[PDB]
Design a protein around this nucleic acid. Sequence first.
DNA 1: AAGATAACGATATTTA
DNA 2: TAAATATCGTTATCTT
Length: 107
Amino acid sequence: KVKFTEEEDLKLQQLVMRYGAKDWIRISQLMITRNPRQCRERWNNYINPALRTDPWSPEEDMLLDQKYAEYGPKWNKISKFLKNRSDNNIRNRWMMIARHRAKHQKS
DNA sequence: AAGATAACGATATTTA
DNA sequence: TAAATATCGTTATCTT
């Protein structure tokens, strides 16, 4: 239902190695039920970087505050200043961390 | 049961 | 103007 899986993800690494990082249309011939750019989205957010060992540090948290209000939601450009995390990873984590940063009013 | 992460589709923007 | 690209946004699934 949600498409993809580990078996297909492993094939991605092989496909990217053989087809390249632009001929995603070739992969779209084997997988048509997905946006071609999304196949790249996974490669770029899983096998390309090393988004692990916890998120960013508080130093980045307070830095990203400014490194965002200057270049809108250009996470694509922000990930370049923080050599370690990618788009769908930072965006996800930003909204995630914001849920804790924004506190929780009650009484 | 609730929370967190991941992935796929679409919209908006940019370039051709 | 049309097409192509990237990030965004939401839901589903999985883990704790």
